[PDB]
Amino acid sequence: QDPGPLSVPEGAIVSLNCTYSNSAFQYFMWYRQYSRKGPELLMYTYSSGNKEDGRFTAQVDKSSKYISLFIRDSQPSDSATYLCAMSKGYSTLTFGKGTMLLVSPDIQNPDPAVYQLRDSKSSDKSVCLFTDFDSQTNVSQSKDSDVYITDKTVLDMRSMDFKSNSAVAWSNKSDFACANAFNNSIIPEDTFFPSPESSCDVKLVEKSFETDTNLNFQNLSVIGFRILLLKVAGFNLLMTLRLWSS
Amino acid sequence: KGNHLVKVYDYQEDGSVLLTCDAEAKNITWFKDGKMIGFLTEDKKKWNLGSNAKDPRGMYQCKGSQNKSKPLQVYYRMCQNCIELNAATISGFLFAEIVSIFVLAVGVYFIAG
Amino acid sequence: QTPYKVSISGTTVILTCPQYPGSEILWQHNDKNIGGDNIGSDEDHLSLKEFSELEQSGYYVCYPRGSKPEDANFYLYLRARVCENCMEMDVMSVATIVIVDICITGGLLLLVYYWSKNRK
Amino acid sequence: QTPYKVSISGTTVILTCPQYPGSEILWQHNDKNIGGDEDDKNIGSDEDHLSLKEFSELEQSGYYVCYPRGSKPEDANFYLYLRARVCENCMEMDVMSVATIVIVDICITGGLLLLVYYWSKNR
Amino acid sequence: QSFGLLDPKLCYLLDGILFIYGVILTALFLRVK
Amino acid sequence: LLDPKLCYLLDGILFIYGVILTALFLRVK
Amino acid sequence: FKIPIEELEDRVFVNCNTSITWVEGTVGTLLSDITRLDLGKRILDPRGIYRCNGTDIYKDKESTVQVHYRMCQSCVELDPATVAGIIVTDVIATLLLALGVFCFAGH
Amino acid sequence: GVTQTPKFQVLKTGQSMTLQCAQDMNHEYMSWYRQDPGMGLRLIHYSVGAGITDQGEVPNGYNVSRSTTEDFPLRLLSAAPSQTSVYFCASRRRQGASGEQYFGPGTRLTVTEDLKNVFPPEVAVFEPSEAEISHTQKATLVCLATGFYPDHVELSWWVNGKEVHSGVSTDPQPLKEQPALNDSRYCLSSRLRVSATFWQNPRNHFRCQVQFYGLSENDEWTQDRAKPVTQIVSAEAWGRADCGFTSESYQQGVLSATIAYEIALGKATLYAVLVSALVLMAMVKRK
Ligand SMILES: CC(C)CCC[C@@H](C)[C@H]1CC[C@H]2[C@@H]3CC=C4C[C@@H](O)CC[C@]4(C)[C@H]3CC[C@]12C
């Protein structure tokens, strides 16, 4: 079985094939393993032909001595490792080593930028962040040995139906700034390096104003005190005129 | 564990403060400063203390079918009736004081003669 | 038997356990050994200068020297929030402000009353 | 459709199964039977009611169905989903009612003062 | 943006009645003089 | 609109004006 | 057959396998895809009745769900004694002005 | 299904170990596998019936025993730094009737040379930047757990006392701080992305939690620093806004207005007592 991570654009047809040359086996299956978990059975066939279980489809060729698996409508939630296995009528299943698979998503409106996050007041680090890319961009490792770069990952936020790419850099030393951080990588033109002048929209902060029951009670008490001042002040002004008009 | 089995469950959306007793039984009995205060069957597992802005204190216990547990003293102070004192606060209080004593003093002036 | 005492003055929390007459005392916060060698331990106290709400909150215990922490008597759970130049308003501090302010303004009106009485 | 009824007063929630006028009614909360066994003195049941005393927000909030006796819970096709925050002596105001109380207060006081002034001139 | 019962209509209400009172009293005072 | 300080400062102006202007009207009568 | 009602970060979502039909109540906002509806923030009390349709061998069936929230955010906690104190002091204040007028009435 | 215990284990050179496998769907025969980078799955021992055990492919250093029909434990006689792997346990019904194995969840072992090499993590939290909030109107938080050994952490996010699973991306593999040495430490990161109006509330509470797996209370520790054991380490933040009017300052305004009106009402009651007493004294002295 051929290893090596292969990158597939999202919404395509994937082809994996093993060659078992040569013996005479009788029972075939496929497994799937996510990261840091255990294997899991997907499909179990022992005839020549097709046995569909949804969008998964397998082929067996006895005289040609290769099997195959086909996935259609490939989501980004299929990035795993796939293991082909075969056996005789007896025990001791024989495994292959597996094949890593990667499906990269559609990213319809890109907007790349590099941001400087605020400090922590508990550690002496400072992190930069290079976010949503267009998924063709390759992120390289660092050259100095005091700078740490990570690989690129994908996150899915479902409260807005949105997905993105990210990569994080951090360091201890001085003369580390976000304008020179991802210098070793090839970078798209017209990414957005911001300026240190502030910009705080005030109409956006009013969109999250809350209220408890204590604030309601205290506002109503202020409203009551204003009325009592009006009545007592009316009394004092009525009595201060009778004593001097006489 | 050493007979320490009353823990606090914090930072909910409403300001509520809860307590979970750690024993395998049903019909949990709660105590506060020795005297009994409650009665909790199954399908509820957490005793409610109220909101944290009224800042509860006290010493609490639970028992199951074995002996009682050791107490747990709780102490909140989330101040919530505080005023920060600045130049603006002190300036406003002084100015209101001066103008009110001026109006009252003019009134007493026409009262006397 | 006797609970712990908590004393807050500014941004300094000082807490005290009077449960052991004479011994050497160790403290422990969230199962991590605290005090000795910001933070300082007296003979019987535990000073905490510049208290932070999120960092210091949770379980405290005091136990004598040479024992285990799972044996002491009971724990303290505290959750505080401090301020510098902040005064809090009870139903007694307000009454002191009202009564003292009435007793201050009640003299100037009598001085103006006799001053204007002996003018005309 | 005929909706359910939710009535809240203090810390007592009273639901009302709307559909079935002349049969016997069971209830179920997150696929477990509730009420109708003389267990949990806080939880009662009537001809088409379900009383929940000392309601809790964190627990006891979610789905609720009602079905007639002699049928299965899986043949139900109309559910309820509720959350509620309750505490004792916590009423629900508006903005217009507070302003009506203020305005009526001022007008009653002014009417009394005009009446007492004319009556005192007519002495 | 949930005010609840902290709307500015209540504070501005209790000011607005006092504004009407002041305007009417200045009107009658100019009517006499 | 949001900051209620303007409402309090506006309340402390009209009250003294409405007291002084009222006590100056009933005297001329 | 339940309609799944999920609660992301501070909003309420009606989730189904096909498109959702309004019946009455809160209208909402369709996302970039069909089959999900956004009812807005939780503290503004969304209430309504929604109806979906079936696939995934519940095919050729139908269900309904009613949503009710009561996040009590315009609410005041008042005792049955404080109401008495407020009513008594306001009555005493009005009688105090009423005593103040007819000491002015003849002078 | 198949269950096995423990999940994570660290042990020094020259120490035995027993790790269990259990099963209750009445299958009868069981196996043990191990897995390495670039080698695949390799067989260790198998037991075709209750009492009968054979050998497999790499059996040197291991010992099995099949007594009952639900249990099949494995022993390491004396462990060496080549025993570092991940160990799986599989089960089948009967001998080629339906070739469907059922693997367990896994168990990770590391074998060091000395217990002075073990360390717990350190966690920090970094608050989002203002330029992202004004440019895209979303906010991203970052958590860094750096400097731990061995490689047995688990990371999570908790908002207002509850776990979240939507909007999170953790690195799949921990990285090494210097990737040329042998006994080097590790590091690992994570993200949380959230809408802008949910970060601007000062009432919400965020935190990043890390579960570590280290020593226990049967180990000898003669070192100056504290003993690295199994614990939880974390870091927290409140939401906050830069400019404008929150519900933190509205409270300040209402409190100051309450005290001002209480003082003024007190002065007015003093003046009422004065002028009432003067009118009563005058009306008495008229007679
Ligand atoms: C008006 C007189 C007769 C009686 C009471 C005094 C008046 C002036 C009181 C009532 C409410 C008060 C205000 C309430 C709140 C604030 C906000 C604070 O940041 C500065 C002071 C300031 C602006 C106060 C100034 C004084 C004030 C206006």
TrEMBL record, chain H:
Residues 122-230 form the Ig-like domain. This is T cell receptor beta constant 2. Disulfide bonds join C143-C208. PROSITE patterns: IG_LIKE (PS50835). Keywords: Disulfide bond, Glycoprotein, Immunoglobulin domain, Membrane, Transmembrane, Transmembrane helix. InterPro entries: Ig-like_dom, Ig-like_dom_sf, Ig-like_fold, Ig_C1-set, Immune_Resp_Modulators. It is found in: Endomembrane system. It comes from the Eukaryota. GO terms for cellular component: endomembrane system; T cell receptor complex. It comes from Homo sapiens. The chain crosses the membrane at residues 259-284. PANTHER family: TAPASIN (PTHR23411).
